[PDB]
Amino acid sequence: QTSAVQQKLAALEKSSGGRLGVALIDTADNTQVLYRGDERFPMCGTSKVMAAAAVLKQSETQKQLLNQPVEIKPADLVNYNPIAEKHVNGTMTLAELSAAALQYSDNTAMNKLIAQLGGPGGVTAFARAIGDETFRLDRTEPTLNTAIPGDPRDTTTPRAMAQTLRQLTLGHALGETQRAQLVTWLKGNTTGAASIRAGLPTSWTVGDKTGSGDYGTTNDIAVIWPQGRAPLVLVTYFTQPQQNAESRRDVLASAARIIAEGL
Ligand SMILES: [K+]
Ligand SMILES: [Ru+3]
DSSP states (O other), X not given: XXXXXXXXXXXXXXXXXXXXXXXXXXXXXXXXXXXXXXXOEEOGGGGHHHHHHHHHHHHTTOTXXXXXXXXXXXXXXXXOOTTGGGGTTEEEEHHHHHHIIIIIOOHHHHHHHHHHTTSHHHHHHXXXXXXXXXXXXXXXTTGGGOXXXXXXXXXXXXXXXXXXXXXXXXXXXXXXHHHHHHHHXXXXXSSOTTTGGXXXXXXXXXXXXXXXETTTEEEEEEEEEOTTSOOEEEEEEEEOSXXXXXXXXXXXXXXXXXXXXXX
16 A cells, blocks of 8 residues: 555656665654665665674674774775775774764775675675675675666665664664764764755754765665654665766655655
């Protein structure tokens, strides 16, 4: 059965010319709204949440892990490295790499997180360990963002990602201290004001992680604390038919606005 909200999301999708995926969990009652909730989308930089969370999980049994230095060499720089480039021929700690990956979307930082986990499959292994059977990370930065239609690499579904983001940020996938650190990092994101945030009432607080890639892929995953309400988790994924398509953060904002108005 197609709800009013799903009908509005379908109308939005029609006029965008791309493919939209949405999953909401309202933790007030544990109910879900889904639009293409079981279709696979390229995660792009939204996958950085899983990598950072996997390192946080490792840190539960190693008190000093987040202070561990990692060498940054000139050859490590990839396509978008606003924090790592300052530390070439130097080091960053795993906390610094996590913060850079999440809050600035530094791709070199993400590669160091992936390497700390033993490669893309180590990120997938963590996903499986916390009950996510859908997520897969197959490649490093920058190629994990190729976002080719039909390609299963580096994809998940909206349903799966919402459930995982809820477990990580509001549930008990991580220890208490670690959960709080993840939430702090997400709430300090610098890249999100044009995406889910832009569709929500001002008073609501958001922590989010964006992503982008080829095929005009434009993504955001968020944990939301509405005014006077239990928290929400919202995934919005969007991808387009041609490789060179422009980003459409406005479509994510429009999806968020529809979800907010349907609560
Ligand atoms: K793009
Ligand atoms: Ru492995």
